[PDB]
Amino acid sequence: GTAELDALWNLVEAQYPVQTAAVTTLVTVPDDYKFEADPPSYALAGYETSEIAGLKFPKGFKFGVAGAAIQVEGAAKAEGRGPSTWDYLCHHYASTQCNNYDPDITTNHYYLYPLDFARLQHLGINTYSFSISWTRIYPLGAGYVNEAGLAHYDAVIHSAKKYGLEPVGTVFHWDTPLSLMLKYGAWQDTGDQIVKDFVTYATTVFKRYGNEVKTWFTFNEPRVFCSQNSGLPYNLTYPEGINSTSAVFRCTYNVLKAHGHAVKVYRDLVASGTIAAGEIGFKSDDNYPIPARPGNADDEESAKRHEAFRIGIFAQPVYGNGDYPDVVKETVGDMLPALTDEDKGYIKGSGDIFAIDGYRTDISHAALNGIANCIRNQSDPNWPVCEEGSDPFAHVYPSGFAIGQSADPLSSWLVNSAPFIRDQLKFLTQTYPAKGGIYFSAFGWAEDAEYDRQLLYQITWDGLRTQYLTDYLSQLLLAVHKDGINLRGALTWSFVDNWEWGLGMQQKFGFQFVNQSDPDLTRTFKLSAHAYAQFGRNHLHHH
Amino acid sequence: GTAELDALWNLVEAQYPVQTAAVTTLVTVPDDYKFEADPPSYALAGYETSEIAGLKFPKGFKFGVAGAAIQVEGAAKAEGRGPSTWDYLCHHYASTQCNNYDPDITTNHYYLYPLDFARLQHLGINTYSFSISWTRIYPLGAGYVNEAGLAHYDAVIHSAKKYGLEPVGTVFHWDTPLSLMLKYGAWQDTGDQIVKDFVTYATTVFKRYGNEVKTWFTFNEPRVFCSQNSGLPYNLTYPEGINSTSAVFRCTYNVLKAHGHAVKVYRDLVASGTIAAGEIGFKSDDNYPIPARPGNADDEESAKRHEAFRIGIFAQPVYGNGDYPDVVKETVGDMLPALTDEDKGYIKGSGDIFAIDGYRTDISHAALNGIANCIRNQSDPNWPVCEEGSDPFAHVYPSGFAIGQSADPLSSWLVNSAPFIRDQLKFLTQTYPAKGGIYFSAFGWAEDAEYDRQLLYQITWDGLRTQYLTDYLSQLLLAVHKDGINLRGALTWSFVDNWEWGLGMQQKFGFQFVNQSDPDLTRTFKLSAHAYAQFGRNHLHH
């Protein structure tokens, strides 16, 4: 094999090696596979409001679930894969950065996907969102191609379609190739090797999969991704002229460039009939918060600064006027490379569809020390947004009561803000309009302390996740019928409990429970999976 | 008090003493007291169903909250109080029986009650259910009376009525006088001194408060209480001829006798005009479970056995044919003293009102080794009900899915089983009829891991407690209109996070938060309090 791949894994496995799952072969779904019995008939009573009686989502609405390669696959060294930065991080700093977990095995989706798909068909899911592992295709990020990796996703996609799941592919879901980080700092690249290497990678997967996959996302949540570049292991190999503050905005630029160029390739492939016609964009996240004090001009300014730094910095170069928002430029200056007119030519209009991972909406309080004073000082704790960013403010009205129900406190950013969904959608489609509409591409619940339950029946009756999924879907439905939002789909994070980055398998986002103390990693439906099923039975067109 | 009060407390305090609250004086409520602001107006949407639109509880419905003296009061040693078995238990075995808590202070309701009552008025509560501390009235259980104790409840009752809360009094809520346990084993008394001592106590409080308190319960959950008598500190002082197993049914016998004789005294005081005419009963708890497999005769029999040991053993002697359930006698034998003809003269019909602490409904799986094999073997883990008692059975259908949402795993007996309320009330009113009707005398939610929250806004939006209280109230409202249940009130446990017995202040049951890290133990409304308030506004006659 490759000597530099072997060396990279050696580097990763130096304190401790990759562990292997109990099951390392593709599973066979017996024709007789017995699904666990339904919950009692009264279980779903009361979640659905009569406000939505009879309403349907548009024909062709993608009613789906979402995962991510490194979060669900496992098989971290299988069939020629190369390490990502996360494989390195959690094998060297698991105790302080990865909650003592690693993504070696996670849910073993890499080998269990046929069974997972069969279980999704049981619920009536019609769409399967996944991401491709870059280092399964190019184990060193650039150079040679790993055919076994390419063939693996052919099989996944084929299996998904067999079970009635339309496949939606994300190109990059945060799993940066270790090789590229070491060689030139990956997304910190002061030149443009990263764009070229991402373009080569994306081209390859478009060509290999574009006939089967007709909805593409280049990047999952690039703003959240680039904010992680401020830390380990990225800041072991910063290129000179880059530090942990500029690294965030050098990542932003390089990511916008990579997305624009990839999109040009994709459109060339569609326009030439090389691959099936399809649509492409990226997944935004976060929200335009409501001001803590209505009609307070400082709170409105910090709210706008929140949207600018959290959504606008990517959305406006793509769906906007082609530049970064004016407030972002006035605050970060030379740390955020200007978009040359060549840059803008690739990036403006490079979004056929918008997608918002709309987990929640926040509340903005202007910095207590004054916004002007805060934006001058890169060391102020509320820089650059210059709202009070801590939880006692970001979720709390002047009343001291919260905007809504909190989830697990290890993911304290997550709240149930369903009544605010429609205004988020209105703002986004009027501000970042895309010819192909908007997906609600990720939303899900981390039930408080679900990881501390020991008995299955206590886990599976998951009220607040059931409530959150139902509430959010209801507002999506109403957004279509009452606001005329061109809503294309709804993808819940996630169909299984999975490896939640720094929190590892502790944090539980699935509408199915994964038994991590069982060698087979048995899935079990939670009540929320059945609530999702019932909602699609009631509010999808089936004729 | 006597030197015997000093000796008993010296015994209780032998390893570490009773701690004192930062505030040791009765608080006064400033006229400008500022309640915290309301939740957003969308916060309560969607909880109430249309099934109940326009429906109202009967006129005079008691719409209230419940506490118990030792769970909320604190002031464990103040104003002459004597120690209870729990004061001893948690000052001596705290790390193994009390979760390293004790009831020295709890919520400091003993000094804070005027403020608590102002906050309950702001919610439109109209009924306050409370228990009287026996050892505040008789510090030794028997003998001398502590006048400062009697005067304290005079002022509590007066403050309650002033804030528009009808006072509902429980004579005994588990706080056994330590002196009586050392002297003759308290409720394990193989004679009848425990009955005399309880009756003298009940008399004293009936006379003192019966003009202001018109709804009385002798005992809170006597089945649960008596099950504690199998353990510490009660099993350090069993009389000869009593063991951890018979202590439960000796307790059961004496409580029934104490109840009958106390009710007798209650009626004589009413007949003679010494006190206002009211109603007395006791609070049952638990449920008649559904069988795991419907139509399975084994599951149906173990379900009946459950009701017999959990409800029938107190309810049948009082509200039914006046004897213990047959299955109870057949299984327990001479451990359960027979009810004499005289006994029955006091006990039978001694219940003007039924009260059920209707937290939950269970599922009954017949014992897997077979009911016949289990009833004959006191060593069997499932004796005497001879259903599978463990959590993976008591809450789970054969399907593997639960009957309902679980609450916090440290109180796993609690689930949300609102769909089953109307059936429970049908069974109870048809089987244990009371002229005065039935109270839903306790129900509430322990929000999972609420104790691990560190920011207040995360505590107060308490979705599953809010859902639970609304689900339960809704079904209660339907029991009145669709089933014709003479439901006399609904008292939720509890108005404050408080001292939850062996879990101490860790388990959270209040629709208000209590800040145990704050010297003033400040209260904050959770969303559930506002949900309770709004249900009262929508569904009480005014």
Ligand SMILES: *[C@@H]1O[C@H](CO)[C@@H](O[C@@H]2O[C@H](CO)[C@@H](O)[C@H](O)[C@H]2NC(C)=O)[C@H](O)[C@H]1NC(C)=O
């Ligand atoms: C590189 O980024 C990491 C973030 O992972 C920084 O880690 C911080 O280290 C400081 C040292 O005092 C701690 O106070 C912080 O708590 C750490 N942050 C986190 C989130 O772990 C690290 O300091 C950075 N190093 C350099 C060279 O800038």
Ligand SMILES: *[C@@H]1O[C@H](CO)[C@@H](O[C@@H]2O[C@H](CO)[C@@H](O)[C@H](O)[C@H]2NC(C)=O)[C@H](O)[C@H]1NC(C)=O
């Ligand atoms: C990280 O890099 C940035 C940019 O080089 C530093 O921020 C600058 O600090 C200089 C002080 O010489 C300011 O006058 C510049 O205006 C700041 N940058 C810009 C362009 O806004 C930052 O301090 C660097 N070092 C850290 C954060 O350790």
Ligand SMILES: *[C@@H]1O[C@H](CO)[C@@H](O[C@@H]2O[C@H](CO)[C@@H](O)[C@H](O)[C@H]2NC(C)=O)[C@H](O)[C@H]1NC(C)=O
């Ligand atoms: C998770 O799976 C494990 C293993 O399949 C289940 O636990 C085992 O149950 C047996 C009972 O026969 C115990 O004696 C074993 O010790 C358990 N195995 C362990 C702990 O590794 C368990 O029931 C499942 N958990 C849930 C919540 O479904």
Ligand SMILES: *[C@@H]1O[C@H](CO)[C@@H](O[C@@H]2O[C@H](CO)[C@@H](O)[C@H](O)[C@H]2NC(C)=O)[C@H](O)[C@H]1NC(C)=O
């Ligand atoms: C008195 O009752 C207590 C209950 O608090 C009993 O405590 C048990 O002790 C046994 C033996 O060590 C343990 O196996 C149990 O786990 C304890 N039960 C608890 C604390 O849940 C004690 O055994 C009883 N003493 C006598 C004399 O029977």
Ligand SMILES: *[C@@H]1O[C@H](CO)[C@@H](O[C@@H]2O[C@H](CO)[C@@H](O)[C@H](O)[C@H]2NC(C)=O)[C@H](O)[C@H]1NC(C)=O
């Ligand atoms: C506690 O005392 C009771 C009193 O009966 C004991 O119950 C008896 O147990 C013996 C042997 O197991 C049986 O032969 C009798 O039939 C039982 N009596 C009754 C009335 O059923 C019980 O065994 C004692 N338990 C302990 C632990 O002391």
Ligand SMILES: *[C@@H]1O[C@H](CO)[C@@H](O)[C@H](O)[C@H]1NC(C)=O
């Ligand atoms: C910048 O913020 C840091 C942290 O609040 C503070 O110590 C420092 O004084 C600030 N500097 C200025 C110029 O405000």
Ligand SMILES: *[C@@H]1O[C@H](CO)[C@@H](O)[C@H](O)[C@H]1NC(C)=O
């Ligand atoms: C009674 O139950 C125990 C379980 O504690 C068991 O070991 C024993 O065999 C059973 N039967 C008897 C004692 O006849």
Ligand SMILES: *[C@@H]1O[C@H](CO)[C@@H](O)[C@H](O)[C@H]1NC(C)=O
């Ligand atoms: C409890 O009180 C302490 C001290 O007053 C306070 O600092 C803390 O924030 C409070 N905790 C809450 C409200 O959860």
Ligand SMILES: *[C@H]1O[C@H](CO)[C@@H](O)[C@H](O)[C@@H]1O
């Ligand atoms: C377990 O086996 C896998 C192959 O499936 C290896 O990649 C891993 O290093 C471990 O030996």
Ligand SMILES: *[C@H]1O[C@H](CO)[C@@H](O)[C@H](O)[C@@H]1O
């Ligand atoms: C998958 O991989 C493991 C080693 O990694 C083997 O033991 C297993 O039989 C299968 O080949």
Ligand SMILES: *[C@H]1O[C@H](CO)[C@@H](O)[C@H](O)[C@@H]1O
């Ligand atoms: C793949 O195939 C192996 C047999 O080599 C099984 O053991 C495994 O469970 C999976 O089906």
